[PDB]
Ligand SMILES: [Zn+2]
């Protein structure tokens with residue numbers, strides 16, 4: 001029972017489960033959009049949970065040519 005997110009240990013009633021290891025209830029949050037995540041609607045990058053989409057699919061997932069934004073990001 002140890003948090004992949006923050007690197008603490010995870011007290012029981014403060015827990016959430018994903019990738020067969022636990023987390024902190026607050027922690028499990030998008031590091032893209034900053035939405036607190038739900039019972040199996042997230043997904044994990046290496047020491048950072050996220051949206052299942054788009055945020056996961058966008059930042060950690062194969063993409064097209066190379067038309068990334070200039071300075072302010074968008075639907076890339
Ligand atoms: Zn945590």
Ligand SMILES: [Zn+2]
Nearest residue numbers: 030033051055
């Ligand atoms: Zn998100």
